[PDB]
Design a binder for this molecule. Structure first.
Ligand SMILES: [Mg+2]
Length: 157
């Protein structure tokens, strides 16, 4: 409870990611975004039905891919995203498609990509600090910018 990576002191990039998924009355609309404090560096309207969790992972994976070879500090408004980047990768890499007990592995394909994407950046820190997602600081600013951009990419699905 309440865990996070420490931000890299000399980061090349400082981004905020967010996945948004909601029903616009009947249909499920999802969107992902990677932004700075003032600019949207990447946004994409997502396939209908995409869960908020899957969207939050897609956003984060995308940020990692764009930060290849660089030092990245990325903030996630999701507890799921940070937690997912700290799962026991070993499980997602055993032989077969299912868990040991024989069930399906939730979001196996995204998590597998997230895990690979993790080492594209030269140095990486995934910060999850809710106490600053509100108010007026670079973080609150950045959280709003990303939650807004993702929200909009969905609305324009
Ligand atoms: Mg979110």
């Amino acid at each position: 409870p309440d865990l996070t990576d420490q931000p890299i002191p000399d980061a090349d990039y400082t981004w905020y990611t967010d996945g948004s998924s909601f029903l616009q009355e009947g249909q499920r609309r999802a969107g992902a975004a990677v932004t700075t404090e003032t600019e949207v560096i990447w946004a994409r309207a997502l396939p209908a039905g995409t869960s908020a969790q899957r969207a939050e992972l897609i956003a984060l994976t995308q940020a990692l891919k764009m930060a290849e070879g660089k030092k990245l500090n990325v903030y996630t408004d999701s507890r799921y995203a940070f937690a997912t980047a700290h799962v026991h990768g070993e499980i997602y890499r055993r032989r077969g498609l299912l868990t040991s007990e024989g069930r399906e592995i939730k979001n196996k394909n995204e998590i597998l990509a997230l895990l690979k994407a993790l080492f594209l950046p030269k140095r990486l820190s995934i910060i999850h600090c809710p106490g600053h997602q509100k108010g007026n600081s670079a973080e609150a600013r950045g959280n709003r910018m990303a939650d807004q951009a993702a929200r909009e990419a969905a609305m324009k699905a």
